[PDB]
Each structure stands twice: as structure tokens, then as C-alpha cells.
Symmetry: C3
Subunit: 93 residues, 3 copies
């Protein structure tokens, strides 16, 4: 369901990066950026998995852990966007 859509997303990114006439270095940066997002999203899901296992009811530290994990994912997404934007502006510069 959700993991499939992310799998579709990252596959398209690889296809696009392969479709673009770019060098080895820039191609690595494009891929690795999206790869990092995958890593953070998986680790964040691991956090939420532990949280939902520990607590049966609501707790402050439980919501804190989820917010911090979701924040890390956001920072990762932003980092990927900035990376793609900078490189593409350079290639078509």
C-alpha cells in the first residue's frame, strides 16, 4: 500500500536520473539523496513500531518520539529537494 508508493517514487527517481545526461558524481548524489530518505523513513517506522508496542495508552514521551522521528524525515526530504534543485539548475545552467 504505502510502501509500494514509496517504491514507485524511488524507482522513478532512478529512471529520471538514468534518463538525464549527467556525469557519475551528480548521478550518485541524486540517487543517494533519495536513498537517504528511504533509510530515515525506515528508521522512523521502526521507532513508531516500538512505541506502539510499548504503550497501550497515550503518553507524552511517546508522542515526542514520533514527532522527532517525523521531523528527521522532513529534514531528509528537504535535503533531497535542495540537492536535486541545485544539481538540475547546474546541469541546465
Amino acid at each position: 500500500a504505502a510502501f509500494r508508493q514509496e517504491g514507485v517514487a524511488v524507482l522513478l527517481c532512478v529512471v529520471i536520473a538514468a534518463w538525464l545526461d549527467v556525469d557519475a558524481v551528480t548521478r550518485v548524489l541524486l540517487i543517494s539523496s533519495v536513498m537517504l530518505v528511504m533509510i530515515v523513513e525506515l528508521l522512523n517506522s521502526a521507532i513508531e513500531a516500538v512505541v506502539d508496542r510499548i504503550g497501550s495508552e497515550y503518553h507524552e514521551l511517546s508522542g515526542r518520539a514520533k514527532d522527532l522521528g517525523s521531523a528527521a524525515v522532513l529534514i531528509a526530504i528537504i535535503d533531497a529537494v535542495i540537492t536535486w534543485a541545485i544539481l538540475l539548475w547546474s546541469h541546465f545552467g
Copy 2:
């Protein structure tokens, strides 16, 4: 959320934020600017993940357990490695621009 109003996250937050601003103004090529950003961004990501770990641990209980201390130590280790990676990154790249 309520995480933003903390002395620890303000200091770590501005340290990374300043580096991004500086890197955005530095006169270097694209791939260099990307690495300057991605390095300090990675540090922030690891710090947020590490902070999430500690939050989960404290959620468990106040009574100490060996795995509880191990979880925090391993988390701090990842943060350390991330900072080292950031320093080395900026050191190698800026050494050319600095001369």
C-alpha cells in the same frame, strides 16, 4: 511541536542552520555546495533520530537497565560519527577554496 523550545535543540539547530546559510553564500561549484549542505543536514537528522531513541527509552521507565544505557550510548555514537563526517567533509572541500 514542544521540542523546538529547548536549549539543546536551539544550539544544534543554529549550528547546522548557519552552515547552510554560509554554504549557500560560498563561491563553489554545485556538487561542492550539495556536499556542504548534505553533511550538516545529516548531522541534524541523526541528532533527531538519537533524540527519538532517548524519548522511547525514558518512556519505558525510570528504573535503569543495561540495555537502556546501551541504547543511548549507541545513539550518541552515531551522532559523533555524523559530526566527524561533517567536519571531514567541510575540511576537504574548503581546503581548495581557502588555498
Copy 3:
């Protein structure tokens, strides 16, 4: 004061964690060796600054995810129960992030060295 004591304390925790992870597992020790070799090779390698960083950044990320996944397992094992679905799920997601980080590093080294022909 507070800023200096946090750096020292975090350095103490980090070194205590790196020590514990090195003592407990043999696979971790060999992994650290593989990383250290990669760092030295990339430093002595005749490539430009950007490639040198990428080779380093790859293996450094591997260790970070490894330590973070090991932190997850520590919390999971901390929890006391016979068996839970989210117990295996948490480690499954963590192990997935580890294998992704390793593969991405291997491919990076593969592509970069193949383009350098060295």
C-alpha cells in the same frame, strides 16, 4: 560551562557505545575494519575532492545506520515479552535500512572507481 560539559559527556557516551559495540559483536569489528580501510584508501586515492568525500560519506553512513539500528535492537530487547509482532517488525525495518546503506555504498564505490578507472 554547559556547552563544554555536553561535548565531553557526549564524547564519553559515544566512546562507551563504540567500545561496547566493538566488544559484543565480531561482525561489527570486521565491519569497522572494512570502513577504516575504505577511509584510508580513499584518502590515498588519486581522485578529486568531491569523489574523495563521496567514497568517505558512503562508508560513514553505513556505520551510522549500523549504530542506529543497534540502538533500536537495544530498546526492543529491553522490552519484556514472550513475542510481539512489532518486535520483529522494528528489527525488520532497521535491518532493511542497514542493507540499503551498505548496498548504496558498494554501488557508489563501484560507479566512482569505474569512472576513475583506478
